[PDB]
Write an enzyme that holds these catalytic residues in place. Sequence first.
Site, PDB file in Angstrom:
ATOM      1  N   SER A 134       4.571   1.771   1.706  1.00  0.00           N
ATOM      2  CA  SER A 134       5.417   1.620   0.572  1.00  0.00           C
ATOM      3  C   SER A 134       5.428   2.585  -0.426  1.00  0.00           C
ATOM      4  O   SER A 134       4.349   2.985  -0.832  1.00  0.00           O
ATOM      5  CB  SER A 134       5.282   0.234  -0.061  1.00  0.00           C
ATOM      6  N   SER A 143       0.728  -1.235   0.057  1.00  0.00           N
ATOM      7  CA  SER A 143       0.100   0.036   0.086  1.00  0.00           C
ATOM      8  C   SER A 143       0.881   1.121   0.085  1.00  0.00           C
ATOM      9  O   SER A 143       1.852   1.355   0.244  1.00  0.00           O
ATOM     10  CB  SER A 143      -0.841  -0.058   1.327  1.00  0.00           C
ATOM     11  N   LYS A 144       0.478   2.357  -0.589  1.00  0.00           N
ATOM     12  CA  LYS A 144       0.969   3.696  -0.595  1.00  0.00           C
ATOM     13  C   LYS A 144       1.434   4.129   0.789  1.00  0.00           C
ATOM     14  O   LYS A 144       2.150   5.002   0.834  1.00  0.00           O
ATOM     15  CB  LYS A 144       0.419   4.426  -1.526  1.00  0.00           C
ATOM     16  N   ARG A 145       0.447   3.694   1.693  1.00  0.00           N
ATOM     17  CA  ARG A 145       0.723   4.134   3.134  1.00  0.00           C
ATOM     18  C   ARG A 145       1.940   3.685   3.833  1.00  0.00           C
ATOM     19  O   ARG A 145       2.379   4.391   4.575  1.00  0.00           O
ATOM     20  CB  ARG A 145      -0.674   3.896   3.899  1.00  0.00           C
TER      21      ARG A 145
END
EC number: 6.1.1.17
Length: 468
Positions: free
Chosen positions: A249, A245-247
Site C-alpha cells: 500500500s 505496509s509500504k510493500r
Amino acid sequence: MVVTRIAPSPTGDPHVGTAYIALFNYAWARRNGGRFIVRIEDTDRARYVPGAEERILAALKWLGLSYDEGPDVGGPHGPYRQSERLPLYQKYAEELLKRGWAYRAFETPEELEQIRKEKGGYDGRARNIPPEEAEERARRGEPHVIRLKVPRPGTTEVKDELRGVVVYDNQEIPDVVLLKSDGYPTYHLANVVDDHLMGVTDVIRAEEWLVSTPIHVLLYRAFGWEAPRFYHMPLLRNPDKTKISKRKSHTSLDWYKAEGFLPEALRNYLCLMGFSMPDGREIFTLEEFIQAFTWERVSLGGPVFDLEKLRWMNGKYIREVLSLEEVAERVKPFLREAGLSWESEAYLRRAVELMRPRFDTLKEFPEKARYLFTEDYPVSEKAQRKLEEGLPLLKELYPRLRAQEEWTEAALEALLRGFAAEKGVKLGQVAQPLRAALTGSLETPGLFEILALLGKERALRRLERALA
Ligand SMILES: N[C@@H](CCC(=O)O)C(=O)O
C-alpha cells in the site's frame, strides 16, 4: 478538560497511519472542547531524517488537523521535541532508582545474548547487586542501562476504553530498559513522563502499543501519578487484511498529495477507517465527523485502507462536492508541474468541465488532457495505427473541413455524418482516425466538442501535421 496528542517520530515520510491516529485525536479533543497537541518524538538520532518533522507537521495542516501546542506554535508545557528534554528523562529515571522502582544493569550485549538464550529474556539478575555497589560502579563510569523493577510476583490491570480490562500476570512483563547507556530514554519512560507533564488525559494511539500499556501503568504507579484513559485504535490494514505496509500500500502522505488526492477526500476517507456515520452517509465534512463522533461507533475489526475506494471518493469530491471553478484552481499546480500553461481562465474552466467525468485525481487531468494545452502532445502507438488505417478518409475529409464555415459541435457532427454516408462507412470509421489526429488519443471527451473547442484554424492547423 480533555487533552489529546499525536506523537510522531520524524524518521521517514509522513505516514498515512499518523494522519489516521491524528484525526481521531483531533476529533476527540474538539468534540469535548479540549486541546489537541503535537509532541515530536525525535530521540532516535540514528533514524532522524532532516525535514521529516516539517513534512509531518505540514501534512497534518494540509489535512486540516490544526493543533494547539507543538514545536512550531509553541505552548505552555514545552519543549515539544523530546530531543530537547533529555535531561528530564534522566532525572525521572534517577527518581525511580530512589523509590526502588528501577535499577542499574551492567550487562554487555554478549552477556544479554547468553542470558536471553538461557532464560528466554533478561532475568533481572542485576537487582541482586547491592544498591551502593551499583551507584559506585555508575559513578566510576561503567556503562549501563536503567531498568524498570517490576514487582515479582504480582499482577497489573490495564483498562482500554474500547476493549475493556486485561489482567496481566507480572511474569509477562519484562524489566524493560527505561534509560539507555547513551543517556537517551526508551519510549516507555518518555511517553509516560511527557503525557503526564503535558497534561494528556486521553491517550489515543495505534493498536501495536496496546500490550505495552501495563509497563506504562506500572510507571504511572511508580511516580505516584494518575493514569490517563487509554484508547487503542483498530489496526490500519492492507487490502489483504495484513497490517498496512509500504510493500502492499502507498503509505506516504506526500505521495497522496503529489498524486492529486484532495486533502478533504483523504481526510473523509480516514474518517471511515475506524468509524461509521449513524445514517451510513459516506461523504461528509470534518465538522460533521466531529459532531457525530462517539467511541460507540468505532469498530474494533481493524479497517482496510483501500486505494480503490479512496480514488472513488476523490472522484466524487472532484465532480460532486467541489465547484467547477474550485477544481480549476486545484489543477493549476499540476499543469505547471507538467510544464503547461492555459490561454485564459475561461478556456481552462472549459477544459476542466470537459475532462471532469474522466479523472479521479488532479494529476490525471494534465496527463489525460495534455493535447488541450500544448500543440506538441504525445501520440500513442494505438492511436497512430488507427490514424494510419484511416488516413485516406481523413485526406478526403480535410477539404470539407477547410471549406467548413459553421464551426460548431453540431455542424461538425453533421459534416462527418454526411461524409460517412457519402463514403458508405459508419461514422465511427471516420471519427476515431480524426480523434487520433487531433489528440494523439483514442479516449478523450466528446470528439465534436473537442473539435470545436480549439477553433477552426487551430484545429485545421493541427490536422495537417497528421498528413506528413
Ligand atoms: N512516536 C510513536 C507514537 C507513540 C504514541 O503514540 O504513544 C510512533 O511514531 O509510533
